Design a protein around this motif. Structure first.
Motif, mmCIF file in Angstrom:
data_model
loop_
_atom_site.group_PDB
_atom_site.id
_atom_site.type_symbol
_atom_site.label_atom_id
_atom_site.label_comp_id
_atom_site.label_asym_id
_atom_site.label_seq_id
_atom_site.Cartn_x
_atom_site.Cartn_y
_atom_site.Cartn_z
ATOM 1 N N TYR A 52 41.871 -10.307 37.199
ATOM 2 C CA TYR A 52 41.659 -9.179 36.301
ATOM 3 C C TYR A 52 42.727 -9.111 35.226
ATOM 4 O O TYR A 52 42.442 -8.755 34.080
ATOM 5 C CB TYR A 52 41.611 -7.878 37.083
ATOM 6 N N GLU A 53 43.960 -9.442 35.572
ATOM 7 C CA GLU A 53 45.045 -9.468 34.608
ATOM 8 C C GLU A 53 45.037 -10.713 33.738
ATOM 9 O O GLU A 53 45.916 -10.853 32.886
ATOM 10 C CB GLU A 53 46.369 -9.335 35.344
ATOM 11 N N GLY A 54 44.080 -11.615 33.929
ATOM 12 C CA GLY A 54 44.001 -12.822 33.135
ATOM 13 C C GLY A 54 44.912 -13.936 33.582
ATOM 14 O O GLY A 54 45.041 -14.932 32.868
ATOM 15 N N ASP A 78 39.750 -14.526 30.539
ATOM 16 C CA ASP A 78 39.575 -13.076 30.633
ATOM 17 C C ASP A 78 38.123 -12.642 30.817
ATOM 18 O O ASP A 78 37.723 -11.593 30.316
ATOM 19 C CB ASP A 78 40.140 -12.395 29.391
ATOM 20 N N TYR A 79 37.290 -13.448 31.475
ATOM 21 C CA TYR A 79 35.954 -12.977 31.831
ATOM 22 C C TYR A 79 35.988 -11.823 32.822
ATOM 23 O O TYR A 79 35.115 -10.957 32.784
ATOM 24 C CB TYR A 79 35.123 -14.108 32.427
ATOM 25 N N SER A 81 38.082 -9.215 33.391
ATOM 26 C CA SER A 81 38.232 -7.909 32.755
ATOM 27 C C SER A 81 36.975 -7.514 32.001
ATOM 28 O O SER A 81 36.467 -6.400 32.149
ATOM 29 C CB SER A 81 39.415 -7.935 31.799
ATOM 30 N N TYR A 82 36.512 -8.388 31.119
ATOM 31 C CA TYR A 82 35.298 -8.119 30.368
ATOM 32 C C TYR A 82 34.153 -7.669 31.261
ATOM 33 O O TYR A 82 33.394 -6.767 30.895
ATOM 34 C CB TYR A 82 34.917 -9.372 29.595
ATOM 35 N N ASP A 85 35.212 -3.969 33.209
ATOM 36 C CA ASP A 85 35.223 -2.809 32.329
ATOM 37 C C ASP A 85 33.812 -2.400 31.942
ATOM 38 O O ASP A 85 33.474 -1.215 31.960
ATOM 39 C CB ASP A 85 36.040 -3.106 31.082
ATOM 40 N N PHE A 86 32.961 -3.376 31.642
ATOM 41 C CA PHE A 86 31.568 -3.101 31.313
ATOM 42 C C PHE A 86 30.826 -2.453 32.474
ATOM 43 O O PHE A 86 30.127 -1.449 32.296
ATOM 44 C CB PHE A 86 30.896 -4.410 30.908
ATOM 45 N N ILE A 131 36.758 -4.331 40.838
ATOM 46 C CA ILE A 131 37.723 -5.424 40.958
ATOM 47 C C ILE A 131 37.789 -5.959 42.381
ATOM 48 O O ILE A 131 37.702 -7.168 42.600
ATOM 49 C CB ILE A 131 39.108 -4.961 40.474
ATOM 50 N N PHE B 6 52.977 -13.054 30.545
ATOM 51 C CA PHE B 6 52.376 -12.978 31.870
ATOM 52 C C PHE B 6 53.394 -13.102 32.993
ATOM 53 O O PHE B 6 53.009 -13.275 34.149
ATOM 54 C CB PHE B 6 51.293 -14.046 31.999
ATOM 55 N N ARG B 238 46.486 -0.766 33.682
ATOM 56 C CA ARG B 238 47.469 -1.842 33.722
ATOM 57 C C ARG B 238 48.458 -1.797 32.565
ATOM 58 O O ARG B 238 49.375 -2.616 32.532
ATOM 59 C CB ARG B 238 46.762 -3.198 33.709
ATOM 60 N N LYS B 240 47.956 -2.772 29.470
ATOM 61 C CA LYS B 240 47.836 -4.041 28.767
ATOM 62 C C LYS B 240 47.178 -3.850 27.407
ATOM 63 O O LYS B 240 46.188 -3.129 27.285
ATOM 64 C CB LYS B 240 47.050 -5.050 29.603
ATOM 65 N N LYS B 245 45.285 -10.668 25.922
ATOM 66 C CA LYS B 245 44.689 -11.737 26.717
ATOM 67 C C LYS B 245 43.991 -12.823 25.910
ATOM 68 O O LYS B 245 43.607 -13.839 26.496
ATOM 69 C CB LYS B 245 43.702 -11.152 27.730
ATOM 70 N N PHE B 341 35.612 -11.506 23.964
ATOM 71 C CA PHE B 341 36.526 -10.893 24.923
ATOM 72 C C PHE B 341 37.174 -9.638 24.375
ATOM 73 O O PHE B 341 37.534 -8.754 25.153
ATOM 74 C CB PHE B 341 37.590 -11.888 25.355
ATOM 75 N N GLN B 370 32.403 1.252 26.479
ATOM 76 C CA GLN B 370 32.712 1.280 27.908
ATOM 77 C C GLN B 370 34.212 1.244 28.162
ATOM 78 O O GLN B 370 34.705 1.909 29.077
ATOM 79 C CB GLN B 370 32.030 0.119 28.622
ATOM 80 N N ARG B 371 34.955 0.454 27.385
ATOM 81 C CA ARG B 371 36.421 0.494 27.513
ATOM 82 C C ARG B 371 37.026 1.783 26.949
ATOM 83 O O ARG B 371 37.984 2.342 27.514
ATOM 84 C CB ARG B 371 37.036 -0.725 26.837
#
Lengths: 466, 466, 466, 466
Positions: A52-54, A78-79, A81-82, A85-86, A131, B6, B238, B240, B245, B341, B370-371
């Motif tokens: 999730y943090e990439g 970063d898939y 997170s994407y 979040d969605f 997550i 990171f 997080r 972030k 990312k 992303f 959504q975010r």
């Protein structure tokens, strides 16, 4: 990773065959669950959290390739997170609406929800569900004699349950690592809090003595709930995260991209190739960019018998090239499969006519709706336990009459989808709805001050009488 | 960069296990947090800030290539600004609307918001949230006995929190570097301000003595708030940033472009290639642009036995070429992934029919919505603390009655999206809304002076009576 | 797998030719069924469950390939989850509606459904039907003298039936493994619960003594139902899961993808190929990326008779390539066949005009509707037995009069499909339906507080009288 | 298979030239029919049933290929299930509606249909019709003096008929195999039940004595019907299943797919090919993935006469490839022919505009409608015999007056096709239909409680009077 994610013991639920009192007698059993949690389950959650943090595998795994004049084109996509979040925004973007017949219950519910900011709390739970596949919340009777609700980190919380088909929760364990910002030593200490139906017991431990639970000073603490306060929410029956099963495909996309970045970086895009037994002045070659005529004069070999013959000379440009059609088809397939299995819309094939922006999304997201309806049920199952805790402690403070039963509450879920306020107004008013002028004006931003407009209209309606 | 962005310690939240008084006793603990902030966290923020200013790695990293007749086609693509400006404008472009039942509270709120220009302040916070993932604001009781609110730079501010699940904030540290415009010496001095629930303590320090905090002259200063004034806003759970990312993908696009600029600049676009044992006059070659017939006459070698034979001669143009299909497919993929992303719309595939400009954008920006709904919740959580500070000091100045509770305020967020004033007017008036003539005219620019038009209409309505 | 999934004995239904009393006399027959269940049927269910969790064959089967400088690109595609979640959501997403003429029955039904959360229970059954093809539910009279309904895991439950064409159920067996979290020994113990029309008998066993059923302490326990409480639901006549028959195609897609990941990972994307008897300095080759002119000077061989002749030299780039057209056509065919045989919509060919989002889905899902109508009948057949158990125990507690027959209940199934609330409102009101103002307003989210809007309208309707 | 499916004797109807009493005298004739059924007809049905379960020939037939480093890519495509579920759902998805003038008959009909769950029974018959081409149902007078209707398995039931053009049914045979779950011996026993117009006779047999029918204990049993209770339903005049004639094409598709999976699995996708008399270090070849320049230096052969000459060296990539165009055209043709001959819609060419979802399906399924109308007639012919049995036993219990004739019943068949409830409402109300408010509201899911809405409307209609 896979040795963690898909290990069998990484996702087991903890039972215990005794009562709670048989577990607080001989607390040494709890240490075993903590060990199992640290050894088998926390590693999985850690792998999920890293994605999730990439911090995907392709960053942290070393290349066997490593020298000057070579490069680590490590890249991470970063898939995860994407996706999360969605999916969480779609589920819990619009708050839950609480409905009850008894306003004496509903006022207490909504006052608790107001004090605890339950909209934000619910979204922060739902993201943990996305997550990790599971999330925990703790309710406490605070100092200042007030009821507070907090999310508990899944990497440090677990529950022990009855061995029966009823599967009640016996006990709940939180354990945290007391790290300085300065240094770490030959031992490092975990504080353990063991919650029960009547109180919480606090312990100090370290891994090096075998997680021996020795009471911390002022160890026991009573609480006024009559059941174990920690509640566990599940993403699904299996408690599996939403991207957990495409992590393989994400790694494959990371590799298939970093290796093209390597190809781009290592090889030379084009070169002039000159062949033959020629004198090339190493300084004249630098004039290659201002040249217009390249003249190659071959060597004339002379035989001992006097014959003269010409060496070969050649010149042309050669250029770096790769299989674009097959690597694009492969990376297109990986990306498409990630979106398909997560039920997220594929932004490279998704193209919109500009027609019915609500119905179109309800069409696209049909599969995600099918998963969310199950998630919605399992979320409500947790909210009902939150409510049962709340009523128990409100009665145990005489804040409400013992006669109330909170199971009359209904929880109404609206999906986060785009709404047209104009087309909704048309529907509402064609349906014979009424709106007050002030409320109507408040919907439209072209009024600077809806408060003053009413007076200006009163002037217009007044001085037309004259 | 990646070794900064990171790193685990680069994003830790600071706890402390004592009370505030146990931290102001033995202030030497605060120095450790400052050191950790300088050593681990500030470097990350610096990397993020550099990318917002366009000072991407590809500018500042040296090429091993460096000589005359070669060039540094260093280029930096400014994706990070493009992303953050778009995402912050979408979130906080239209101001927050404050609503309350008690106008005695709402007037004080809106007077504070007016004095402090809270529209611009809120946007300046939201951009910090987008760049760094977190932002800080400081509230002070100024001279002239007035309440002021300022943003504090994230590179120089941090907070220390309670070790409890409640996670209150114990203390807040601002530290600034006293650089001349002229010179820098063997020591350089950081002023530290340590905020607490009752006052601020001011210190002088330098890194060379180990950040020893020795009180600056007139060190302590009381403030009338009853909690620590600095408030921290988070972009997400997080903390972030929004482009943090995809910085890898941005570097890859920088490289994939600068290496094509190198290919374009180093090699020669075309040349005439002449081959064979020929006399070429170095002056006649300059007439190559005015030539129409190129005649190549071969050398005739004569054997010792008298045989005559012709050397080879050849002529033609050769031209520089590269794999356009595969480099375009690669740079198209990088650009597409950056927009995917970040949930920004991809301007190379985004094409609009000219149909429903509001609903179309609500379709495109569904994922960014959504975010943003999570961000909106975490922003409101900070605004409520700003409001609690404000009420505390208004009561502590008897500017309002102690009976008021500001948690009755509601904060209403409108997304920055295009609106059609004509289609809104149609909706409002079909809904049976009323508008005053002056307010109506003010919406339309074809009136030069709405004030005079009313009189001219009075003349028309008068002299038609006659 | 196939040796498990499609074995004949893996899916047999257990009959017994005696009565229940002839089976509880000589309980040693039950042990045989348990053995058969462990030996033949549980392995199949395990294979199915593994595919739902994404633990497909391609992860757990070893490659004969395994060394350094080679990689296990094991990947698993999660088709089975994607299928089952979609098919169960379509069937049981919207709850069943219970209808009866006698409100004395319907209130008891809906109070049981409320207490037992039967919406979530029904979905959790339907997913078992989709994964395994069959599911079990147990009803008990709890302590606190209350009726509870739970799902029983298909991997550990089976039923024995009459040998007659009527095929009544004689007995129901649950058996569970008492695993510690710590260790496993030379024996491991299964608790067996044997349910009958009058009670449950509890036994201890292990596989090593031959599953000898020796009574556990406090073995027998009476229950107030008059028939065996466990109910079995079937997905279809054959009790076959929804993806069980495409598992072959899923394996083929796993292989056809992992072997392309291997091709991508093992071979080199491009290389410069230099040929000929040349001196190449191993250090100058590293300057290959900064080179602009590659000069190859051939070796000049000198004959003993003095003749001079040039070796061949060559240079160019070679690049890795594969049959994209045929591997894409093959993987497209596999994916298409998986969606066709499961009747799931194929997201690569499914493209929507944005027109009639309900009717369009009813068109797409016509085949899945044809299978679901059979599933719906077989589900109702189970719900009627649940209801017969409920009435039996309500009468046996005098909670309802003996005169009631619950077979008057009707179960109404609505498919989970998208609905337009605006177009439904238009239909309802054009049909001459009426709605209360409060109910109408509750449908529209632009009202913040429908409760207050009524009063504001009362003000508007009042002060217009003046 | 084909030697079973299309054998002549596999589908013969059994006549007998005597009366029923001449057949129960010398019951040894019945044994012959049982033998013929086991030898000729059951094998065909078994082949059909195997294909419905997906146990197609390509799984169970052995490859002559079988060794390590080779694989059995056996795959089975499940066309037969996909076909039969679709065709049965289209026919009997919506229940039959029973209509009669005499409510004294219709109430008894619908009470029988309710008790026996005839909706599910009818669908379970229709699927047997689709799989086997024929199906059987048995009606019995149960204990508890009640009339029950069950489907009888086609693999174990047959009927003997009159030799006359009237073709009455003389006798009906059910025979079942008494298999343990434990073992099978040198004999295995079949129980035979021989139904007649007056009773059923029960026998024990085994194949090893020649199917000698010796009465089982309590052999004879009277029944109150006056004709043989087993009824046979046919799919068509020929009693042929719906997919029985495309099983050849299904095998061909299984083979054409498994052989491509073999091609994919056996051969290597690409290789670097190096040719020439070269020293290749077996360790340097492993660096092939990190290589950028491949240098091939040829062998220089030296002649005894001193001449020097260079060996050939070559390098390049070779890749696996096949005839995609012709194998795709072939597998496309097979799939298209399967759908054409079964009259199922071809999901690869079927693409919908989103226009008229009912009329569009009635267009697509025109041919399947042409076959179903014949099936519908032959189904009604069986339902009329079910009804004649029912009236016979209701009169023989004085449950109805002898005067009733059930042939007045009409059976009304509605095809399972999508319906738009809104467009149907428009049609009904434009036609001047009326609906009660409660019934109207029940059609729309946006009412939570249609029961309470009426009261809320009564309040709105009340307090507007004031």
């Amino acid at each position: 990773n896979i040795n963690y994610l898909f290990n069998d013991e990484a996702n087991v639920v903890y039972t215990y065959d005794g009562t709670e009192s048989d577990l607080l007698q001989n607390v040494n059993e709890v240490s075993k669950y903590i060990e199992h949690h640290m050894d088998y389950q926390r590693p999985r959650l850690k792998v999920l959290s890293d994605y999730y943090e990439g911090k995907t595998k392709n960053l942290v795994e070393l290349t066997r390739r490593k020298e000057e004049y070579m490069a680590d084109n490590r890249v991470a996509h970063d898939y995860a997170s994407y996706i999360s979040d969605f999916i969480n925004g779609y589920f819990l973007g619009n708050p839950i609406q609480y409905q009850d017949d008894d306003k004496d219950v509903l006022e207490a519910i909504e006052a608790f929800n107001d004090l605890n900011d339950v909209e934000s709390h619910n979204r922060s739970l739902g993201l943990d569900l996305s997550i990790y596949g599971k999330a925990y919340e703790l309710m406490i009777r605070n100092q200042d004699d007030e009821t507070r609700l907090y999310k508990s980190d899944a990497m440090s919380t677990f529950i022990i349950y009855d061995n029966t088909v009823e599967r009640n929760s016996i006990a709940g364990v939180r354990y945290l690592r007391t790290k300085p910002i300065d240094k770490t030593d030959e031992d490092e200490v975990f504080t353990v809090d063991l919650f029960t139906s009547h109180g919480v017991y606090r312990y100090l431990t370290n891994r090096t003595n075998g997680l021996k639970l020795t009471p911390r000073e002022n160890s026991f603490e009573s609480h006024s709930f009559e059941r174990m306060p920690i509640t566990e929410f599940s993403n699904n029956e299996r408690r599996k995260g939403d991207y957990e099963k495409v992590i393989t495909l994400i790694d494959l996309y990371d590799n298939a991209e970093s290796d093209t970045a390597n190809y781009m970086s290592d090889l030379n895009d084009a070169m002039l190739l000159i062949k033959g037994n020629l004198n090339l002045d190493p300084v004249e070659v630098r004039k290659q960019k201002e040249a217009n005529v390249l003249f190659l004069e071959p060597t004339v070999y002379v035989d001992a018998e006097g014959r003269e013959t010409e060496g070969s000379v050649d010149g042309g440009y050669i250029y770096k090239q790769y299989d674009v059609q097959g690597t694009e088809a492969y990376k297109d397939r990986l990306n498409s499969d990630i979106h398909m299995f997560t039920n997220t819309p594929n932004m490279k094939d998704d193209n919109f006519s500009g027609t019915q922006s609500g119905e179109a999304m309800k069409y696209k997201l049909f599969g995600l709706e099918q998963r969310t309806k199950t998630k919605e049920g399992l979320f409500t199952k947790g909210l009902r336990r939150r409510a049962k805790l709340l009523e128990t402690i409100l009665k145990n403070t005489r804040s409400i009459d013992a006669n109330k039963d909170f199971n009359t509450v209904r929880y109404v879920y609206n999906r986060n989808l785009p709404k047209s306020l104009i087309e909704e107004l048309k529907a509402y008013i064609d349906s014979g709805g009424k709106i007050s002028q002030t409320t109507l004006m408040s919907l439209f931003s072209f009024f600077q001050d809806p408060e003053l407009e009413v007076k200006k209209i009163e002037e217009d309606e007044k001085e037309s009488i004259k």
